[PDB]
Amino acid sequence: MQIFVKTLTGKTITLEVEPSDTIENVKAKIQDKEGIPPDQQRLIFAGKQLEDGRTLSDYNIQKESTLHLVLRLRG
Amino acid sequence: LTIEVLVTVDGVNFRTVVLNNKNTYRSQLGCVFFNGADISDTIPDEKQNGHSLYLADNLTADETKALKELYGPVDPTFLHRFYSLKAAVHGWKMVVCDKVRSLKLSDNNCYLNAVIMTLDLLKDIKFVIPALQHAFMKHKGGDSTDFIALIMAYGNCTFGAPDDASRLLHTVLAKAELCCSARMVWREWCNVCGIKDVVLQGLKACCYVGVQTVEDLRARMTYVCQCGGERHRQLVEHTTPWLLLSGTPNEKLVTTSTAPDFVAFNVFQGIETAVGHYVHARLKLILKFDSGTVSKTSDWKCKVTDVLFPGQKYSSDCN
Ligand SMILES: [Zn+2]
Numbered sequence: 001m002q003i004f005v006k007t008l009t010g011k012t013i014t015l016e017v018e019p020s021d022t023i024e025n026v027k028a029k030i031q032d033k034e035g036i037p038p039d040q041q042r043l044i045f046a047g048k049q050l051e052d053g054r055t056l057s058d059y060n061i062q063k064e065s066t067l068h069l070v071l072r073l074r075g
Numbered sequence: 076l077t078i079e080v081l082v083t084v085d086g087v088n089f090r091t092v093v094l095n096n097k098n099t100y101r102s103q104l105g106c107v108f109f110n111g112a113d114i115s116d117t118i119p120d121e122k123q124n125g126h127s128l129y130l131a132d133n134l135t136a137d138e139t140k141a142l143k144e145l146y147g148p149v150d151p152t153f154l155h156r157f158y159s160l161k162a163a164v165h166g167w168k169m170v171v172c173d174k175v176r177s178l179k180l181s182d183n184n185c186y187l188n189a190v191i192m193t194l195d196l197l198k199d200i201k202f203v204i205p206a207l208q209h210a211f212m213k214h215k216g217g218d219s220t221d222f223i224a225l226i227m228a229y230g231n232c233t234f235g236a237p238d239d240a241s242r243l244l245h246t247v248l249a250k251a252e253l254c255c256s257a258r259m260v261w262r263e264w265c266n267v268c269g270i271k272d273v274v275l276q277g278l279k280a281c282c283y284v285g286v287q288t289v290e291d292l293r294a295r296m297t298y299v300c301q302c303g304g305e306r307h308r309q310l311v312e313h314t315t316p317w318l319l320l321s322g323t324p325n326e327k328l329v330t331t332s333t334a335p336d337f338v339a340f341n342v343f344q345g346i347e348t349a350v351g352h353y354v355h356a357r358l359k360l361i362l363k364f365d366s367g368t369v370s371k372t373s374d375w376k377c378k379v380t381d382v383l384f385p386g387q388k389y390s391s392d393c394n
Contacts, residue, residue: 047283074237075186
């Protein structure tokens with residue numbers, strides 16, 4: 001299964017994962033594609049922030065789904 | 076020579092543990108807190124004999140089970156981090172301006188001020204996790220140490236370190252529920268695939284990340300369907316006690332000579348790639364709460380992040 005993650009710059013990456021994969025593992029895939037640490041990644045799908053305690057199936061995320069990557073601000 | 080202590084992880088179930096004065100607490104038992112202080116790397120003394128200790132690791136089977144019921148499913152380092160954060164943030168203070176409580180600036184905690192002050196405006200919310208709800212009720216009572224430390228622990232925040240208010244806010248809200256009804260219905264349609272409604276209920280229907288205005292939330296979207304054809308989406312039903320919209324810091328001019336609809340909002344000051352500063356604001360004039368510093372302005376050039384709207388009662392015929 002392939003999904004899509006859009007950044008703020010504009011470049012859109014494609015990730016090959018499975019419904020079983022959790023958000024913690026999805027962030028690991030982004031780590032190997034952009035170099036951005038999982039600790040500083042915010043994934044937004046369908047207006048909801050994705051938490052590391054749940055998987056992709058918990059958010060009903062599947063094929064051809066588009067995710068939004070936003071960096072963790074430091075205030 | 077030897078002492079006995081009472082070990083607990085919940086303050087209700089205790090077990091006796093025998094210790095000598097040969098090795099450290101950590102060596103004999105594990106990471107332990109005594110009246111809030113971590114004494115793991117000290118030698119047991121007669122002065123602590125019979126006293127109660129809070130254990131953070133090397134838990135028994137019973138303690139682990141009670142831990143999961145009390146705090147939910149947490150990582151092995153959670154309890155230590157929570158206990159440690161509690162000790163660290165004990166010196167933090169709330170400033171009270173006209174009954175309104177605001178967290179005083181200290182150790183880069185401004186993002187926490189924005190999170191907490193926003194939470195304080197959200198009616199009919201509660202937490203499922205007993206410890207979190209208990210700390211929440213204490214917070215509303217005037218003692219916020221437990222709640223602050225807990226959400227920092229759940230949010231994996233580090234004492235003294237700058238952090239993201241929106242990220243923490245939605246993390247905390249993901250653990251909460253509404254004490255009333257709420258509903259949000261998206262309608263998607265495509266001439267080939269058909270009409271599809273996406274329903275959200277409860278707290279989930281009161282929060283959205285990606286939009287910061289009611290107008291943009293109710294706007295019709297147009298994109299490409301899975302079949303490759305033209306697909307649309309539009310909000311057709313929204314009934315909430317309140318509405319929290321969150322997005323990236325975008326610069327605008329907020330004025331009260333226009334009579335806005337929103338009740339409150341958070342602002343990120345500084346550049347987004349470096350260490351900035353959060354400020355919480357409410358409209359009652361714009362009441363600004365800068366970590367204990369309170370001021371009023373007619374207008375304000377700022378980069379809004381989270382926005383809080385009143386109750387929604389909306390339906391669209393979608394045409
Ligand atoms: Zn279609």
